Coordinates of C-alpha atoms and ligand atoms in Angstrom, one line a residue:
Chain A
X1 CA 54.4 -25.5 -29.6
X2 CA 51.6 -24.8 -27.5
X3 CA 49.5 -23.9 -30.1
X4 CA 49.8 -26.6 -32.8
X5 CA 50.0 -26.2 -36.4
X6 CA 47.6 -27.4 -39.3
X7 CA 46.6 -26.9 -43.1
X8 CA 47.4 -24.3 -44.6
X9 CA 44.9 -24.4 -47.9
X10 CA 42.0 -24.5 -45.2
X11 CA 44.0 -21.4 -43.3
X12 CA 44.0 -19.6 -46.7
X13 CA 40.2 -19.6 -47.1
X14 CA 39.5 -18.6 -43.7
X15 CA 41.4 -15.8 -44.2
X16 CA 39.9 -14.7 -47.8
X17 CA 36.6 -15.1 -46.7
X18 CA 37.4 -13.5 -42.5
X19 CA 40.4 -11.1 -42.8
X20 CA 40.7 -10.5 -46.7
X21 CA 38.4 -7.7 -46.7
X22 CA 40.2 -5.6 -44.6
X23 CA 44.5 -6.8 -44.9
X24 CA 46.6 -8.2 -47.4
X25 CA 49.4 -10.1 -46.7
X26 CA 51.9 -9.5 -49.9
X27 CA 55.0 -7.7 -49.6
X28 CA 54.7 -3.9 -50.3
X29 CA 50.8 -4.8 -49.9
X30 CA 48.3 -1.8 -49.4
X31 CA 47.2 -1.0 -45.6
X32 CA 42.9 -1.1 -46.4
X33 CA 41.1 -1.1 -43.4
X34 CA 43.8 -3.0 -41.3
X35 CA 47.7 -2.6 -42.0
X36 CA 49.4 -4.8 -44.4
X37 CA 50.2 -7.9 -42.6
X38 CA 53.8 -8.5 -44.2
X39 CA 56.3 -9.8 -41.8
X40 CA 53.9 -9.6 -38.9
X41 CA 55.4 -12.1 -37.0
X42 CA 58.8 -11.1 -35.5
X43 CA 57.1 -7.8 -35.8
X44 CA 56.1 -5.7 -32.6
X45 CA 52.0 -4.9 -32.3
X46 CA 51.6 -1.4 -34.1
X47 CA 54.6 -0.7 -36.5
X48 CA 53.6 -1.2 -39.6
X49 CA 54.5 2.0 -41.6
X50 CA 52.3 4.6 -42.8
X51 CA 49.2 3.1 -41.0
X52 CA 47.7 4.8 -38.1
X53 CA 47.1 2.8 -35.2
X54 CA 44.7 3.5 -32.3
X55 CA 46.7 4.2 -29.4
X56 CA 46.0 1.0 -28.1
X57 CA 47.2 -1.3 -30.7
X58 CA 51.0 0.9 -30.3
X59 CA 50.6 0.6 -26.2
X60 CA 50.2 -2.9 -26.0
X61 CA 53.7 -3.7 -28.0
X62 CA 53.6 -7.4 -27.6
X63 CA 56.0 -9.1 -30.5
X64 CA 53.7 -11.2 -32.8
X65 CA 54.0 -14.7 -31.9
X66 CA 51.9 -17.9 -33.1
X67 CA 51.3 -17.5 -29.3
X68 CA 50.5 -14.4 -28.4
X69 CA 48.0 -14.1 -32.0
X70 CA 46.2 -16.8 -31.3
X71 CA 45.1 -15.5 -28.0
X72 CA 44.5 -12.2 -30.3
X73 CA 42.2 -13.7 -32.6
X74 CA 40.3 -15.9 -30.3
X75 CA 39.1 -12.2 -28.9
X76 CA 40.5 -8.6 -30.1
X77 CA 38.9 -6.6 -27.9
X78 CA 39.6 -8.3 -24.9
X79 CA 43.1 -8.5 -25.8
X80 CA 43.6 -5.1 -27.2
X81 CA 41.1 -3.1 -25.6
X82 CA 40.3 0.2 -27.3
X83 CA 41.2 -1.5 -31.0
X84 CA 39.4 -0.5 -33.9
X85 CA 39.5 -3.9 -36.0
X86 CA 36.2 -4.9 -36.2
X87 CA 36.2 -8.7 -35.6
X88 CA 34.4 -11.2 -33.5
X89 CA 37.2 -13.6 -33.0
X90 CA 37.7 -16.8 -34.1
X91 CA 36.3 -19.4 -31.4
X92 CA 37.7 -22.4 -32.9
X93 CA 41.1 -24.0 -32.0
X94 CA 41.6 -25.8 -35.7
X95 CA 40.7 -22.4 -37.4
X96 CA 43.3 -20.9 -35.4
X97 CA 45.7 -23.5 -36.1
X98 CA 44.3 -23.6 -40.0
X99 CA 44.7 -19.7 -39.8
X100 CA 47.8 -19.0 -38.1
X101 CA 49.7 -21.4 -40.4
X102 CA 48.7 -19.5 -43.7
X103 CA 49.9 -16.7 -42.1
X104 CA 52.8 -18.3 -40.6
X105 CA 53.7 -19.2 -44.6
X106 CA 52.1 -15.9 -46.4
X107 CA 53.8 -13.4 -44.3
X108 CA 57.1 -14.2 -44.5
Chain B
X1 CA -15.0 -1.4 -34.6
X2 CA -11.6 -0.7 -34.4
X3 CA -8.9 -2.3 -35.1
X4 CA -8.2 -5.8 -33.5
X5 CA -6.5 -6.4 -29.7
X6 CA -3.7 -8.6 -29.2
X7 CA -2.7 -9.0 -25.5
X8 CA 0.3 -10.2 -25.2
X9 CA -0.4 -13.6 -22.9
X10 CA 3.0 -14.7 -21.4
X11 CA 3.5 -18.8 -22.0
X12 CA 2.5 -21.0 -19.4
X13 CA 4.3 -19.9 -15.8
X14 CA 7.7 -19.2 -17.8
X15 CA 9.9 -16.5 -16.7
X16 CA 13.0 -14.7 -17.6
X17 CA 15.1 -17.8 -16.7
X18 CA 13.0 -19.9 -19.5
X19 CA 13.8 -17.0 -21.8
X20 CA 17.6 -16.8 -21.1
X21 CA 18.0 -20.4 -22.0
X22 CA 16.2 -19.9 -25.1
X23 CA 18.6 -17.3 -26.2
X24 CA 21.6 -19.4 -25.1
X25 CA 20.7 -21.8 -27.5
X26 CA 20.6 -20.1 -30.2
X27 CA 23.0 -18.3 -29.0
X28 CA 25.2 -21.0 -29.2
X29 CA 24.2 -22.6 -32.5
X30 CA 25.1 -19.0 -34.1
X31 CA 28.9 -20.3 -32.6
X32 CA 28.9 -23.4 -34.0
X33 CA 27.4 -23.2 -37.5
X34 CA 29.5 -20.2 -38.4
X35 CA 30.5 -21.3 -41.8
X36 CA 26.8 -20.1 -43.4
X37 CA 27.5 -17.5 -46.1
X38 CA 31.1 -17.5 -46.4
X39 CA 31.2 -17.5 -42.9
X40 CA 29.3 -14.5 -42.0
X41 CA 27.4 -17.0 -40.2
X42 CA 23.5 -16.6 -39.5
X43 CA 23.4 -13.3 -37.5
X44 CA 22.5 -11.2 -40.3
X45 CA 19.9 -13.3 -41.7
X46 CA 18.1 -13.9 -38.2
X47 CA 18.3 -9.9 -37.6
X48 CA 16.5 -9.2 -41.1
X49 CA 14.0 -12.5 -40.3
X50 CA 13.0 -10.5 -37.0
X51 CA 12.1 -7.3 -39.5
X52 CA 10.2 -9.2 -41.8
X53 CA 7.9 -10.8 -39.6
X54 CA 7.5 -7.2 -37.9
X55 CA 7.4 -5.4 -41.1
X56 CA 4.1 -6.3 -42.0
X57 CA 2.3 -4.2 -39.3
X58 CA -0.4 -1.6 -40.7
X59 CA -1.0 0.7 -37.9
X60 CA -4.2 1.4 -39.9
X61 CA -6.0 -1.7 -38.9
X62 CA -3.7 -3.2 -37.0
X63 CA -2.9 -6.6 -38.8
X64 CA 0.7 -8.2 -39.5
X65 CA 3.2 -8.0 -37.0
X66 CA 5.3 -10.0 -34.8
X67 CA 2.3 -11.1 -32.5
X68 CA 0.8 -14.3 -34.5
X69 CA 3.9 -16.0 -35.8
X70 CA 2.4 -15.9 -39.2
X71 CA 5.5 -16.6 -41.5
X72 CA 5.3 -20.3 -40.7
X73 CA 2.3 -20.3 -43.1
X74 CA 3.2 -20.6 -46.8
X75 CA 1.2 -17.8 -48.4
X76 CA 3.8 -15.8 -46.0
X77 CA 6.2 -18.4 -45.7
X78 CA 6.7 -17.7 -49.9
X79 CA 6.0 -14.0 -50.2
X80 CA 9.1 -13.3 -52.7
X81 CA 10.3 -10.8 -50.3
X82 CA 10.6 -12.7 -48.2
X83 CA 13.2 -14.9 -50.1
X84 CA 16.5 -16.2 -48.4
X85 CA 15.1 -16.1 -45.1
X86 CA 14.0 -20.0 -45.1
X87 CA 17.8 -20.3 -44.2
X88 CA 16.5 -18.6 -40.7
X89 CA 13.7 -20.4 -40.6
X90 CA 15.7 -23.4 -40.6
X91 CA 18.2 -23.0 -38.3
X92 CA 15.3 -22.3 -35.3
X93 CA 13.2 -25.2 -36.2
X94 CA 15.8 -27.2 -34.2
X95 CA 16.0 -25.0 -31.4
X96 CA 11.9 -24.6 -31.5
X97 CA 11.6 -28.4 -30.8
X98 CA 13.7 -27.9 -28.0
X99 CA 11.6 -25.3 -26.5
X100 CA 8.3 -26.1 -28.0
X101 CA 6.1 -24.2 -25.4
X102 CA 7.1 -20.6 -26.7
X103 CA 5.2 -19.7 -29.4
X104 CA 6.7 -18.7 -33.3
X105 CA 6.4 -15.1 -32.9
X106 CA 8.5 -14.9 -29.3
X107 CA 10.9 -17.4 -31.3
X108 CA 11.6 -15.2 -34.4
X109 CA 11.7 -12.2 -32.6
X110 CA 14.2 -13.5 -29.5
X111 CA 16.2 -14.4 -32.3
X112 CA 16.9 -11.2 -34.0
X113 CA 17.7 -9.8 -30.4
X114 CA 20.0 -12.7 -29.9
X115 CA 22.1 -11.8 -33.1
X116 CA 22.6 -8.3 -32.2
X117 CA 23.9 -8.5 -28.8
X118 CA 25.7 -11.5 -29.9
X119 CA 27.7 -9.5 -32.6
X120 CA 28.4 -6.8 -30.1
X121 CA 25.3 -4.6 -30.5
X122 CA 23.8 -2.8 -27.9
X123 CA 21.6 -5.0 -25.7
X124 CA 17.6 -4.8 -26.7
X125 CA 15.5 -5.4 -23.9
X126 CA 12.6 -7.8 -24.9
X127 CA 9.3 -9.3 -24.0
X128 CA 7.5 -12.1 -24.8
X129 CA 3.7 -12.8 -25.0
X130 CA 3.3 -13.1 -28.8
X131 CA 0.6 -15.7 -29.3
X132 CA 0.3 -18.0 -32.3
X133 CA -2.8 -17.4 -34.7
X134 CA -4.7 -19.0 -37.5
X135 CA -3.8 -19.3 -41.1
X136 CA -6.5 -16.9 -41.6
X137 CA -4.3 -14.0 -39.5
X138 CA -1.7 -14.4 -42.4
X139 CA -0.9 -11.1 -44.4
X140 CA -1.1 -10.8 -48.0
X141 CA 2.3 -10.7 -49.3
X142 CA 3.8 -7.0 -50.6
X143 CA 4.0 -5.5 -47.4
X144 CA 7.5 -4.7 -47.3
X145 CA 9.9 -2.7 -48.9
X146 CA 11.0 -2.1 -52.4
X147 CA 14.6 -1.5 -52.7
X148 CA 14.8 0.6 -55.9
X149 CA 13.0 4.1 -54.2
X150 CA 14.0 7.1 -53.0
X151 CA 13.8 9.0 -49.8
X152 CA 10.3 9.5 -50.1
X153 CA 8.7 6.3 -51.1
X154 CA 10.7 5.4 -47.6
X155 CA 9.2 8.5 -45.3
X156 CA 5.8 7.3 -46.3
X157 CA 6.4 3.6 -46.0
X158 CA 7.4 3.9 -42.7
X159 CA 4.6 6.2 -41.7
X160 CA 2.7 2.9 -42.0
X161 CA 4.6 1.6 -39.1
X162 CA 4.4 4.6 -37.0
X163 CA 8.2 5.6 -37.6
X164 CA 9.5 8.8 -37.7
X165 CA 12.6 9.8 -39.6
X166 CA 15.5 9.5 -36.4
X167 CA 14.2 5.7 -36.2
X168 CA 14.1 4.9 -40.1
X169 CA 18.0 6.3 -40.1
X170 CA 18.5 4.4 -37.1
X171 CA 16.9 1.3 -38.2
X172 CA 19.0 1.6 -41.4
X173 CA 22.1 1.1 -39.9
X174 CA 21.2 -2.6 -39.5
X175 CA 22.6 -2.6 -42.7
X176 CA 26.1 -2.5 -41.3
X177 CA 25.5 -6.3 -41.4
X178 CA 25.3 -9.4 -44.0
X179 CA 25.2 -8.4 -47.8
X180 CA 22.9 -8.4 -50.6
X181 CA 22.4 -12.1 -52.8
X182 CA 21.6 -11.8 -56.1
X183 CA 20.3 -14.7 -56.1
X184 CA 17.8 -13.9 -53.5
X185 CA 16.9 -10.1 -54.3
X186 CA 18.9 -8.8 -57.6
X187 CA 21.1 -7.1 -55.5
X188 CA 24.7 -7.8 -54.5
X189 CA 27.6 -7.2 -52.5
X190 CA 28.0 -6.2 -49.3
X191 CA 27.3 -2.4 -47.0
X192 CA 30.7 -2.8 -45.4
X193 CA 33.9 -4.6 -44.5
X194 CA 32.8 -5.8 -40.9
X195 CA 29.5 -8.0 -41.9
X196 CA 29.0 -9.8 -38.7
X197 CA 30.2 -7.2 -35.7
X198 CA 27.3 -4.4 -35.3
X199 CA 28.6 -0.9 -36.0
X200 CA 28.0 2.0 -37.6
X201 CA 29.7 1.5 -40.4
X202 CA 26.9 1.7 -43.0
X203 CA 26.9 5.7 -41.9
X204 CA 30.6 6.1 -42.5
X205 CA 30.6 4.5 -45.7
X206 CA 28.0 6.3 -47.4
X207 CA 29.4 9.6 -47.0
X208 CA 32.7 8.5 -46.7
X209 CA 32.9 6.4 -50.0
X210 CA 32.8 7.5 -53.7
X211 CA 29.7 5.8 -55.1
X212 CA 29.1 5.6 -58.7
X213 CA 25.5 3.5 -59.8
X214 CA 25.8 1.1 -62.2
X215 CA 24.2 -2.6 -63.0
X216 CA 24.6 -5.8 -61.6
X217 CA 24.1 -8.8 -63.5
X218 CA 20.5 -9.5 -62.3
X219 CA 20.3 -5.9 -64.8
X220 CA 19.8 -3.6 -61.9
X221 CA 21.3 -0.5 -60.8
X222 CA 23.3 0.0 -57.6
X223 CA 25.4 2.4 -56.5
X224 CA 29.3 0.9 -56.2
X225 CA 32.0 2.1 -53.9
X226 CA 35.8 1.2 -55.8
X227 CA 36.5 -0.2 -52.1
X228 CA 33.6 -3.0 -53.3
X229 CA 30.8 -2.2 -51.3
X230 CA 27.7 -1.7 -53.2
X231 CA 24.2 0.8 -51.3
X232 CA 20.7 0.2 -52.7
X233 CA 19.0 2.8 -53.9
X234 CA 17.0 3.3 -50.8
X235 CA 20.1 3.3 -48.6
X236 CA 21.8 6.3 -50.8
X237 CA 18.8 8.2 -50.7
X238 CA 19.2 8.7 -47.2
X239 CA 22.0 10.8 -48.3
X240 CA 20.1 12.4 -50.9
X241 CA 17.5 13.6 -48.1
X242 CA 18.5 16.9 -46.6
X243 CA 17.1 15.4 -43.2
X244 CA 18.0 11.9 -43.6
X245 CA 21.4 13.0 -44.2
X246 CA 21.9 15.3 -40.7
X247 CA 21.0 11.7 -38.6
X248 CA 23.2 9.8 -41.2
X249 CA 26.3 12.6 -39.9
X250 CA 25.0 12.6 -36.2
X251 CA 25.2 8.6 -36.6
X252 CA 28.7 8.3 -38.5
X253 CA 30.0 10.7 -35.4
X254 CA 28.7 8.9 -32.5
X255 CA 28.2 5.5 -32.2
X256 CA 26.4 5.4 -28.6
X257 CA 23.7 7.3 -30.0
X258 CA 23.0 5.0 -33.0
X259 CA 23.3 2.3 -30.6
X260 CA 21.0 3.6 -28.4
X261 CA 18.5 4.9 -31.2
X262 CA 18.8 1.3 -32.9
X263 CA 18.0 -0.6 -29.4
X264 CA 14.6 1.7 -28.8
X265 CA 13.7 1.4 -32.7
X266 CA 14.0 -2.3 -33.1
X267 CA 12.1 -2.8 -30.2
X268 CA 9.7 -1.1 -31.1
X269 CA 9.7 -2.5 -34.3
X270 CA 9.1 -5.8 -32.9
X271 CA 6.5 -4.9 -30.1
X272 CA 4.0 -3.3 -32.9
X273 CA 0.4 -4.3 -32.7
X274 CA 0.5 -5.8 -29.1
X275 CA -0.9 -4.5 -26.2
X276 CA 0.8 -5.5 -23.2
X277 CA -1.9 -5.7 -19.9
X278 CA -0.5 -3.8 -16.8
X279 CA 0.1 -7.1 -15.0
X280 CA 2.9 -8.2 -17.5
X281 CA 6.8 -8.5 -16.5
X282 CA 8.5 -5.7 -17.4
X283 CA 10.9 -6.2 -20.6
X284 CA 13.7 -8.4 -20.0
X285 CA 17.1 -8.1 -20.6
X286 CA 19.8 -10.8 -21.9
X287 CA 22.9 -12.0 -21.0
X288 CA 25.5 -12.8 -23.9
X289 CA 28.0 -15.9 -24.1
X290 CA 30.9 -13.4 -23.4
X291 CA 29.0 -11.8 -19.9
X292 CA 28.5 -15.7 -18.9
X293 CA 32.4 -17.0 -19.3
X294 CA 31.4 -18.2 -22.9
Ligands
HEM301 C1 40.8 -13.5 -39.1 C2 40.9 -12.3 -39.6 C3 42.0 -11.2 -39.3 C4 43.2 -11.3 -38.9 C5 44.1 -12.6 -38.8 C6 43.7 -10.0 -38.6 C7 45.0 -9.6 -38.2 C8 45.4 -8.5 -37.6 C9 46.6 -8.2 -36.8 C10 47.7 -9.3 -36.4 C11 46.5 -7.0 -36.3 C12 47.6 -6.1 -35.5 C13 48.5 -5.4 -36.6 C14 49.7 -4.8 -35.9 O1 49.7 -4.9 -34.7 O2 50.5 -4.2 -36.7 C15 45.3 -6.4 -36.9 C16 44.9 -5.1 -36.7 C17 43.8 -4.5 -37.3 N1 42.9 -5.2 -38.1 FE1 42.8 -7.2 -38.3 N2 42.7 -9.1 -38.9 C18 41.6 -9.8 -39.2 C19 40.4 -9.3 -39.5 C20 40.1 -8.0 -39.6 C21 38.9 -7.4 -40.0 C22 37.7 -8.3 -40.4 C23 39.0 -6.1 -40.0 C24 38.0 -4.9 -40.3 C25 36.7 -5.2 -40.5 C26 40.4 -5.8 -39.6 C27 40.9 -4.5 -39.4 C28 42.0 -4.3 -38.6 C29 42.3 -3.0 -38.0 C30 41.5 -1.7 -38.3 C31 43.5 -3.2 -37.3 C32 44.2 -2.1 -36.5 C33 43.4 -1.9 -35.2 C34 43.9 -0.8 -34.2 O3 44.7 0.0 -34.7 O4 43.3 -0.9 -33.1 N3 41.0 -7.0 -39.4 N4 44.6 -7.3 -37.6
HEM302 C1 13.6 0.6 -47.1 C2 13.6 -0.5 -46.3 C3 14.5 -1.7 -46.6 C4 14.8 -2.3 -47.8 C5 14.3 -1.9 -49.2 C6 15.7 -3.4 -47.5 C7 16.3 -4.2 -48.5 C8 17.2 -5.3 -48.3 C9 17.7 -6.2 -49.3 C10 17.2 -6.1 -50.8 C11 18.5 -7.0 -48.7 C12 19.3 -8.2 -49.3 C13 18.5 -9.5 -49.4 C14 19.3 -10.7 -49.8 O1 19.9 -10.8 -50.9 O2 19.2 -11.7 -49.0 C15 18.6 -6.7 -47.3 C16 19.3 -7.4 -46.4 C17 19.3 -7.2 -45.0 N1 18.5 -6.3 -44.4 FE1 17.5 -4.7 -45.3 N2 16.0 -3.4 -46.2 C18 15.3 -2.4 -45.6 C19 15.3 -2.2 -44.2 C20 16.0 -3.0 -43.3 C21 15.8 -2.9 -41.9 C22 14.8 -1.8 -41.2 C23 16.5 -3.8 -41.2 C24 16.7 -4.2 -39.8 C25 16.5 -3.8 -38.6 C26 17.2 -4.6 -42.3 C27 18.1 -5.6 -42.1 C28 18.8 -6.3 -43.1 C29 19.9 -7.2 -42.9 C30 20.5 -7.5 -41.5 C31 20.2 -7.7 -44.1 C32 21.3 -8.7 -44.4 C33 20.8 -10.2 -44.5 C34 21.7 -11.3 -44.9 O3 22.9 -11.0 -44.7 O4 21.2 -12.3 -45.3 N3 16.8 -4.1 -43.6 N4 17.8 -5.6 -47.0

């Protein structure tokens, strides 16, 4: 694709030690700060259930594509304006790649 | 006699410009070395050098403070509460080779500035002057705080730095960002979820969490959320304080506020001791990476 695709053991501790704190990933998982991240992808930008959502995340309704994350990540708040997730993006191509493909694999 | 005078005396025909670039570098480097600490990167570490160097200040007799740079001597350089910050010290020696014409105490200060804005704080105008001084300017160490206090031990410590009670609360929230090391200080864990982005966090955690005190492994006490945050013992008793605890709710409410409180605290903080002349450039504001394309 456009965006590549890279390890997935590197992804994994990026996201432990960046995203951990505040989502988990596994089915069923708990919404903490952020909403459980299970089956993002596919998904439409603010429905996961029982999670409340600033206005902004649920008025942006893009569907969760490798594509469309990436340009998420790199920057939240310029993508989503108005979110609340509390992240300074991730300004490296390979971390996105590295990241995105954990995901890709633990969000199924 | 009085107390000694330090006049600010701006470096060599510099300007705002020189200063800009400075800031851009480290800037920069806090971009590209972002896998320090687990990747919280060095943003917290360069915001609590900037405190330590400023902390020292005794309004008394006016000695310590940012002005002379004194942390690049060892008798500072080593005070043991000081420990963990060589990793700050380390990543500007670089950058101070680059720029060697602005002296340590602009450096260390620019540099907490730098962090703040760059992890989305409010913007901290800033002005330079600090002039470098002797070995025999260096501060004895046990100047700074003590961790395991209470709401009064930190009224009266801050009195020493001229700070009332809005800018203690205020400065506190700095502790939004980074962790504690056990290693380094016998405390740790983490304030907060969001360790690098400035916000007020710290606020909404401590009254929002359930904290129960307990011991660490370094055998002391600390005060444990079940969401795995941990507050030191000075930072709950700012909710123990009837009147630390109003500025902790006004804080937790609105975040403007804290921001602004913050950016007039910490710069005061780090002008202590200094006496501008009337001929000096007013204080200058920075531009971030994001505000120039970056
Ligand atoms: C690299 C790390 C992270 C990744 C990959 C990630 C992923 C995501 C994604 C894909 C969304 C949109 C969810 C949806 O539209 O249903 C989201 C929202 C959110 N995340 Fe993150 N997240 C990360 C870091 C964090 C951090 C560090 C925090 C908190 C400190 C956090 C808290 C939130 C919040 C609160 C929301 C909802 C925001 C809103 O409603 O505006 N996330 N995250
Ligand atoms: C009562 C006064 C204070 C006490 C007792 C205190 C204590 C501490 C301790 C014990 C740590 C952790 C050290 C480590 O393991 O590296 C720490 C970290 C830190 N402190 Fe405070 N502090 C005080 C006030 C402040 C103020 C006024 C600021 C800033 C404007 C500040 C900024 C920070 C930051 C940003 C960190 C995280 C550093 C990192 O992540 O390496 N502290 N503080």
């Amino acid at each position: 694709t456009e965006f590549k695709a890279g390890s997935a053991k590197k992804g994994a501790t990026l996201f432990k030690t960046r995203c951990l704190q505040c989502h988990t990933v596994e089915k069923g998982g708990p919404h903490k700060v952020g909403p459980n991240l299970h089956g993002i992808f596919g998904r439409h930008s603010g429905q996961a259930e029982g999670y409340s959502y600033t206005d902004a995340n649920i008025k942006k309704n893009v569907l969760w594509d490798e594509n469309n994350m990436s340009e998420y990540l790199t920057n939240p708040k310029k993508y989503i304006p108005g979110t609340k997730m509390a992240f300074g993006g991730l300004k490296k191509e390979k971390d996105r790649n590295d990241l995105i493909t954990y995901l890709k694999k633990a969000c199924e | 006699t009085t107390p000694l005078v330090h006049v600010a005396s701006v470096e060599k025909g510099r300007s705002y410009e020189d200063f800009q670039k400075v800031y851009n570098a480290i800037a920069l480097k806090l971009r590209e070395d972002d896998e320090y600490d687990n990747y919280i990167g060095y943003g917290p570490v360069l915001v609590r050098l900037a405190w330590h160097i400023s902390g020292t200040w005794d309004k008394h007799d006016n000695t310590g403070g940012s002005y002379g740079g004194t942390y690049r001597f060892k008798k500072e350089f080593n005070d043991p509460s000081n420990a963990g910050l060589q990793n700050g010290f380390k990543f500007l020696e670089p950058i101070h080779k680059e720029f060697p014409w602005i002296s340590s105490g602009d450096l260390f200060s620019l540099g907490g500035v730098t962090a703040v804005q760059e992890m989305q704080g409010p913007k901290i105008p800033w002005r330079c002057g600090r002039v470098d001084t002797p070995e025999d300017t260096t501060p004895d160490n046990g100047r700074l705080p003590d961790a395991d206090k209470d709401a009064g031990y930190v009224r009266t410590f801050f009195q020493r730095l001229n700070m009332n009670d809005r800018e203690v609360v205020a400065l506190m929230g700095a502790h939004a960002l980074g962790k504690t090391h056990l290693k380094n200080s016998g405390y740790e864990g983490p304030w907060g979820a969001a360790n690098n982005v400035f916000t007020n966090e710290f606020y909404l955690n401590l009254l929002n969490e359930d904290w129960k005190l307990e011991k660490n492994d370094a055998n002391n006490e600390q005060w444990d959320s079940k969401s795995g945050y941990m507050m030191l013992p000075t930072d709950y008793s700012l909710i123990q304080d009837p009147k630390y605890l109003s500025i902790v709710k006004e804080y937790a409410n609105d975040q403007d506020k804290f921001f602004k409180d913050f950016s007039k605290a910490f710069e005061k903080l780090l002008e202590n001791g200094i006496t501008f002349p009337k001929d000096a450039p007013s204080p200058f504001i920075f531009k971030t990476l994001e505000e120039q394309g970056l």
